[PDB]
Design a protein around this ligand. Structure first.
Ligand SMILES: COC1=C(OC)C(=O)C(C/C=C(\C)CC/C=C(/C)CC/C=C(\C)CC/C=C(/C)CC/C=C(\C)CC/C=C(\C)CC/C=C(/C)CC/C=C(/C)CC/C=C(\C)CCC=C(C)C)=C(C)C1=O
Ligand SMILES: CCCCCCCCCCCCCCCCC[C@@H](O)O[C@H](CO[C@H](O)CCCCCCCCCCCCCCC)COP(=O)(O)OCC[N+](C)(C)C
Ligand SMILES: CCCCCCCC/C=C\CCCCCCCC(=O)OC[C@H](COP(=O)(O)OCCN)OC(=O)CCCCCCC/C=C\CCCCCCCC
Ligand SMILES: CCCCCCCCCCCCCCCCCC(=O)OC[C@H](COP(=O)(O)OCCN)OC(=O)CCCCCCCCCCCCCCCCC
Ligand SMILES: NC(=O)C1=CN([C@@H]2O[C@H](COP(=O)(O)OP(=O)(O)OC[C@H]3O[C@@H](n4cnc5c(N)ncnc54)[C@H](OP(=O)(O)O)[C@@H]3O)[C@@H](O)[C@H]2O)C=CC1
Ligand SMILES: *P(=O)(O)OCC(C)(C)[C@H](O)C(=O)NCCC(=O)NCCSC(=O)CCCCCCCCCCCCC
Ligand code: SF4
Ligand code: SF4
Ligand code: SF4
Lengths: 114, 156, 208, 341, 77, 176
């Protein structure tokens, strides 16, 4: 069934837009670290950008990819315009949450979670 | 002892000045700030007691958290509280500032400004009347009256 | 007299019905349905891509001068294929009337931005996007308006939990506000209030 | 276990962890970090305080409603000690002063108080005792601080045989003494060092690592009566360490050798302050003293903690000491100091 | 062209994911070196950081070999 | 009908022009404002001498909560949970069971005063006049937990304020 495309027509143009947004985020991490006075490294920021891009690597719908890059542009322009604070930028890193157990034995020990 | 008497008199004098000269930061969030204006009004004139609004957090002694504290507002409130120099005090006003209030089970409301800043006085109501807020201010003054910093230091 | 029953206005009902027929005749390509509620409110259901032509007609037409955009919101009905229902409320000062225009969309289908018809549509559509996830194609500045910076999810959706997934606090170790998974000292006690006896026979649906 | 001591929840603010801990010396650097970690877990925290209640306010937001309880305490009053340790299954001891006041000596704060806490906690039936000591705790040490540390460690072990004695090397953090003390010598012209800091080796430890190790010592069941050594991953010469501190602070580094007797007299001059002294003779001795190496004792890797290198967290402490010209300089701009391993 | 080649190789060697032992002027990024789209994008950005000229996205996708890199740089001067 | 707030034009006769010029050069309206402020200076202030003088209130005032008793001493509340059902902010928690003598009485009756919006719905829905909002409003505390009232605290409030609560309910019960 034919559907109205948000952008990108097929998957190739969606991948192109993903690459453009990835370049935009990659060239912004030094500025983000400088302006927000982050105690993280530039390499850490670039790795976090790569990780956040990689968790959506299983998407096979061009419209979902277009919406994802739209929201990525939104949260990039929040970082560039310093609308965000260091609070949110470091919320990206989950620096205060305790490491959740992942093995069956530990999960059995701690509680009733699946 | 002579030194004990001297430090007791000195920190009686110090607590008197801080108690009698309270400068709330000009800071209100929601409907609870209207009762702050009515406490500033001629009926319950707060300027009698030495309580004067100052806009800059640097020139403020008390932060009256009067309104709902949201997730989008918490960093700014913490920032102004930090920029307030010491000694500094906090008076949460209304149900929203005390706990969650009408919006306790909300995705965008902080369930208590004491999750963000150390609160000295809690004023109950929705909104607390101007008299209730004045009672809270006088209770804060009486709490300041009991501080013994020089007396703690002398025996330290 | 019936003091406890709202009086009705057949004159206004007939006028609204006539104007609904008028607009439906003028715009057959987009108008799907026309209704007049028994409390005299005209409601127009159109195709989602007729938004700009229908709104421009209702604004600029001599016999329909709906020069004011009273409101613009959306309604989430998950049981529908197109869950989101965009609603426009227009006010005509020249004829002292109000009209409602309703369209539909889902998560992945954009709706044309009506900032070129009404300037209030800018912030109204920003709020619709922020609270439901509906994307508006040609919007001068489409971004979040009400939620926190970096907030994930659209909270007015029916499937979004009331308390969300994260909550904020100040952590002394990191000297900043932190966001952590929501944890409630008292869980919101859900109440089942609906009575098992039908209240309004006029609205009874066929068993099907 | 009592029915109310069974852990519940997901280890959050509103959860129950089953830990009821009375934290002596909670109104301090390590105290605030430990209390924050306990409250973050969702534990019951009791805070005995002798200071003005205004100085305990930063501990209020660290726990949920009712999870932090503030009660007065003396140190010379075993009645108050029992009152605060009666209902807790964990007792943590971090009481200590780097200087000596009129009423409390190094003997009082490091021998008498820890022994009283350990003895009273044993009578009250407290299950676990955590006691903080110093890495260079030697009975024949040149420092009265460390001699009292050793005597108090022996007394605590005698009074509470099932204790966990933790020996951090030198805790560095935002509110620390170490990095701030080294970075605050800008005002006194140059940096006086004994033997130019060429004969001193130090491996400081991160405050968050120390607090996490304290927390994990409570949860570990096979750490009941043990001794741990909390040290950092890298050992530095004193000269290299101070040079890196000044490089990160972007301050001109002007070291000069000052003989030990002259430095001792200088420390004697600064300890006449009724308030918190800037430096003391014992502080000078401890700064000159090289950190001991104790490979037999367990440590952070044994408690599950990966020690954080100083090169990752130094900018948190030393950015405050920079000027406007260098405030925004990034963490990677300064080459790491030369280590001695 | 030797200057361009040596600058390109020097940039490539600094890349963490690039193995210097397996690196060569004819090494394919995807196949010989085992990288992906984002790694190649980072390599192109690093090359831009070296020669100080803007490489568009469309052209950057046809630069999968260091020889292609030096050819593109030589053509664009 | 409508009116124009500002659509008047000034007369251009010589006398009016000279009057306007005198107003411009001699600050007449500014002197008039000064006179108004001076009048208010010489008026009597509207300030009450709190805490020795209190602002007026009414029998309908909604302040601190209280659980009432019958004149025999029996609690009025019958664990019907109408107040809990009608509470907008879900500030009330109620748990009940049969008592020793078989009475339908509560065992837990909590009100979170930091969650309550003081809307008065609980005392409207009570069919036995058990839960009421008393006249007290000066009950600010220093800690958050002290504002989490329970059944014992509410019963103490009722016993403390019973006389004034009864008088107010007698005064205002014919309007309900
Ligand atoms: C942001 O949302 C908003 C809010 O928020 C939620 C709001 O509320 C409101 C509502 C707004 C309002 C209600 C308006 C604000 C309220 C008001 C009341 C406005 C009124 C303003 C004023 C009255 C101005 C007052 C301001 C100040 C700062 C006054 C404070 C006084 C000082 C700073 C003076 C201190 C300095 C002094 C005293 C100097 C003296 C010191 C010395 C050392 C001198 C002595 C020296 C010596 C040498 C003497 C020694 C001599 C000796 C000992 C010998 C003498 C001989 C002897 C015998 C003794 C709005 C609209 C709002 O939108
Ligand atoms: C200006 C230049 C610098 C000046 C330097 C100091 C000069 C002298 C300072 C003047 C001292 C003024 C003291 C004022 C006393 C307060 C009056 C009295 O009312 O206070 C009572 C007692 O106050 C306290 O107990 C102690 C007050 C200070 C005690 C004096 C300490 C020693 C001062 C003299 C030494 C000055 C030289 C040493 C310093 C330089 C408690 O009242 P309070 O409850 O609140 O009022 C509540 C309001 N009510 C009544 C309506 C309900
Ligand atoms: C010469 C000019 C004298 C400098 C005046 C000092 C002004 C204030 C400087 C200062 O406060 O730093 C002292 C500072 C800590 O105090 P704070 O800054 O208040 O830290 C805050 C604690 N919460 O003290 C120190 O750390 C330095 C102590 C090291 C001992 C220095 C000894 C060398 C000085 C004498 C050398 C003689 C050579 C012959
Ligand atoms: C006739 C002969 C003369 C008779 C009078 C003689 C004395 C007159 C006053 C002289 C000036 C003050 C002298 C010092 C007063 C004591 C200060 C002190 O020891 O403070 C110690 C203590 C610091 O805190 P601490 O308890 O050590 O704990 C560490 C914090 N985590 O606690 C504090 O620091 C508390 C905070 C306030 C300290 C400063 C104010 C002390 C009182 C000053 C009163 C006069 C003020 C004049 C101001 C200038 C003029 C307008
Ligand atoms: N900090 C470091 O670099 C290192 C510290 N240690 C040890 O770790 C422990 C914690 O250190 P740290 O947090 O830095 O020290 P702090 O000086 O920052 O805190 C000391 C704490 O103990 C209390 N206290 C001190 N003396 C007394 C007393 N006489 N009576 C009652 N309470 C008292 C203080 O309370 P109050 O404010 O009321 O006086 C405060 O809560 C100490 O035992 C210290 O020796 C070990 C190695 C390195
Ligand atoms: P090659 O083309 O083979 O590989 C391409 C990738 C790896 C992207 C995938 O193989 C791929 O093409 N997957 C298909 C689906 C897809 O393309 N998904 C991309 C989604 S866009 C996206 O997820 C945007 C996310 C925005 C990033 C947020 C920024 C967070 C960083 C904050 C900064 C932290 C410190 C500054
Ligand atoms: S407590 Fe009530 S009056 Fe105060 S801010 Fe909240 S809703 Fe408004
Ligand atoms: S006054 Fe309203 S919000 Fe408060 S307990 Fe009663 S019903 Fe609930
Ligand atoms: S409405 Fe009245 S009787 Fe019913 S549960 Fe509430 S207080 Fe008790």
């Amino acid at each position: 069934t034919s559907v109205k495309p948000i952008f990108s027509r097929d998957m190739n143009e969606a991948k192109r837009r993903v690459r453009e947004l990835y370049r935009a985020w990659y060239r912004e991490v030094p500025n983000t670290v400088h302006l927000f006075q982050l105690d993280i490294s530039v390499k850490q920021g670039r790795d976090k950008v790569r990780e956040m891009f990689m968790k959506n690597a299983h998407v096979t719908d061009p419209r979902v990819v277009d919406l994802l890059v739209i929201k990525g542009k939104m949260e990039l322009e929040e970082t560039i315009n310093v609308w965000k604070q260091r609070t949110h930028i470091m919320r990206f890193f989950h620096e205060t949450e305790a490491p959740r157990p992942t093995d069956f034995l530990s999960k059995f020990y701690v509680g009733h979670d699946p | 002892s002579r030194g004990e008497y001297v430090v007791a008199k000195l920190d009686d004098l110090v607590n008197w000045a801080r108690r009698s000269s309270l400068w709330p930061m000009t800071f209100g969030l929601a409907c609870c700030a209207v009762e702050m204006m009515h406490m500033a009004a001629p009926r319950y004139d707060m300027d009698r007691f030495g309580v004067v609004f100052r806009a800059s957090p640097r020139q403020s002694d008390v932060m009256i958290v009067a309104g709902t504290l949201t997730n989008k507002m918490a960093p700014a409130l913490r920032k102004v509280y930090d920029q307030m120099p010491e000694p500094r005090y906090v008076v949460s006003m209304g149900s929203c500032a005390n706990g969650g209030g009408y919006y306790h089970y909300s995705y965008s409301v902080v369930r208590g400004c004491d999750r963000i800043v150390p609160v000295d006085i809690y004023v109950p109501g929705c909104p607390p009347t101007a008299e209730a807020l004045l009672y809270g201010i006088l209770q804060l003054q009486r709490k300041i009256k009991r501080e013994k910093r020089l007396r703690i230091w002398y025996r330290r | 007299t019936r003091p406890t029953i709202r009086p009705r206005n057949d004159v206004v009902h007939k006028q609204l019905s006539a104007f609904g027929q008028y607009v439906a005749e003028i715009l057959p390509k987009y108008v799907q349905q026309v209704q007049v509620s028994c409390f005299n409110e005209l409601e127009i259901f159109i195709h989602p891509d007729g938004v700009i032509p229908v709104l421009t007609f209702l604004r600029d037409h001599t016999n329909a001068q709906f020069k004011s955009l009273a409101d613009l919101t959306a309604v989430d009905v998950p049981t529908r294929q197109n869950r989101f229902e965009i609603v426009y409320n227009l006010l005509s000062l020249r004829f002292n009337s109000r009209i409602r225009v309703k369209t539909y969309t889902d998560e992945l289908t954009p709706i044309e931005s009506s900032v070129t018809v009404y300037k209030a549509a800018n912030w109204y559509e920003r709020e619709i996007w922020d609270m439901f996830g509906v994307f508006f194609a040609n919007h001068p500045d489409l971004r979040r308006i009400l939620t926190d910076y970096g907030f994930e999810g659209h909270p007015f959706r029916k499937d979004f939990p009331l308390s969300g997934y994260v909550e904020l606090r100040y952590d002394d170790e990191v000297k900043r506000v932190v966001a952590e998974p929501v944890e409630l000292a008292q869980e919101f006690r859900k109440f089942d209030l609906n009575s098992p006896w039908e209240a309004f026979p006029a609205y009874r649906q066929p068993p099907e | 276990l009592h029915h109310a001591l069974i852990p519940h929840g997901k280890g959050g603010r509103s959860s129950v962890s089953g830990i009821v801990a009375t934290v002596f010396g909670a109104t301090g650097f390590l105290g605030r970090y430990v209390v924050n970690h306990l409250g973050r877990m969702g534990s019951q925290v009791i805070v005995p305080y002798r200071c003005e209640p205004y100085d305990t306010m930063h501990l209020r937001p660290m726990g949920d409603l009712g999870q932090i309880i503030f009660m007065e305490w003396n140190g010379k009053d075993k009645d108050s000690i029992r009152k605060v340790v009666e209902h807790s299954n964990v007792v943590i001891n971090l009481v200590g002063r780097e200087w000596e006041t009129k009423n409390f000596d190094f003997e009082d704060v490091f021998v008498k108080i820890p022994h009283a806490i350990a003895q009273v906690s044993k009578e009250a039936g407290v299950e676990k005792l955590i006691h903080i000591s110093h890495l260079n705790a030697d009975i024949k040490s040149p420092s009265r601080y460390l001699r009292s540390k050793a005597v108090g460690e022996k007394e605590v072990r005698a009074a509470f045989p099932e204790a966990t004695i933790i020996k951090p090397s030198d805790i560095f953090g935002r509110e620390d003494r170490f990095l701030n003390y080294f970075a605050s010598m800008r005002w006194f012209g140059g940096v006086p060092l004994i033997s130019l800091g060429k004969e001193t080796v130090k491996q400081p430890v991160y405050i968050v690592d120390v607090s996490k190790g304290i927390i994990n010592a409570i949860k570990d069941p096979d750490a009941k009566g043990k001794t741990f050594a909390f040290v950092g991953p890298n050992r530095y010469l004193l000269f290299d360490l101070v040079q890196y501190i000044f490089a990160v602070a972007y301050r001109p580094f002007l070291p000069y050798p000052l003989p030990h007797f002259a430095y001792r007299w200088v420390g004697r001059l600064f300890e006449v302050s009724p308030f918190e002294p800037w430096t003391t003779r014992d502080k000078v001795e401890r700064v000159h003293m090289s950190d001991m190496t104790l490979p037999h004792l367990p440590g952070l890797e044994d408690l599950g903690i990966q020690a954080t290198p100083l090169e990752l967290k130094a900018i948190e402490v030393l950015r405050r000491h920079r000027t406007y010209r260098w405030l925004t300089s990034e963490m990677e701009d300064v080459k790491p100091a030369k280590t001695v391993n | 062209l030797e200057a361009i080649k040596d600058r390109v190789l020097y940039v490539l060697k600094l890349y963490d994911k690039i193995d210097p032992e397996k690196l060569s002027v004819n090494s394919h990024f995807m196949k010989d070196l085992g990288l992906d789209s984002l790694d190649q994008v980072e390599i192109i950005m690093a090359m831009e950081d070296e020669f100080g000229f803007e490489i568009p996205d469309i052209d950057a996708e046809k630069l999968m070999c260091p020889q292609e890199i030096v050819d593109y740089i030589a053509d664009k001067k | 009908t409508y009116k124009f707030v500002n659509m008047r034009e000034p007369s251009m006769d010589m006398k009016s022009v000279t009057d306007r010029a005198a107003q411009t050069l001699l600050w007449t309206e500014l002197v008039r404002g000064l006179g108004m402020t001076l009048s208010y200076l010489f008026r009597e202030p509207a300030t009450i001498n709190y805490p020795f003088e209190k602002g007026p209130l009414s029998p309908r005032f909604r302040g601190e909560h209280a659980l009432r008793r019958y004149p025999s001493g029996e609690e009025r509340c019958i664990a019907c949970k109408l107040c809990e059902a009608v509470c907008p902010a879900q500030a009330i928690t109620i748990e009940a069971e049969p008592r020793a003598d078989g009475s339908r009485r509560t065992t837990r009756y909590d009100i979170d005063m930091t969650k309550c919006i003081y809307c008065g719905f609980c005392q409207e829905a009570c069919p036995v006049d058990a839960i009421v909002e008393g006249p007290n409003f000066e009950f600010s505390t220093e800690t958050h937990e002290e504002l989490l009232y329970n059944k014992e605290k509410l019963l103490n409030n009722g016993d403390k304020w019973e006389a004034e609560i009864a008088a107010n309910i007698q005064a205002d019960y014919l309007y309900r």
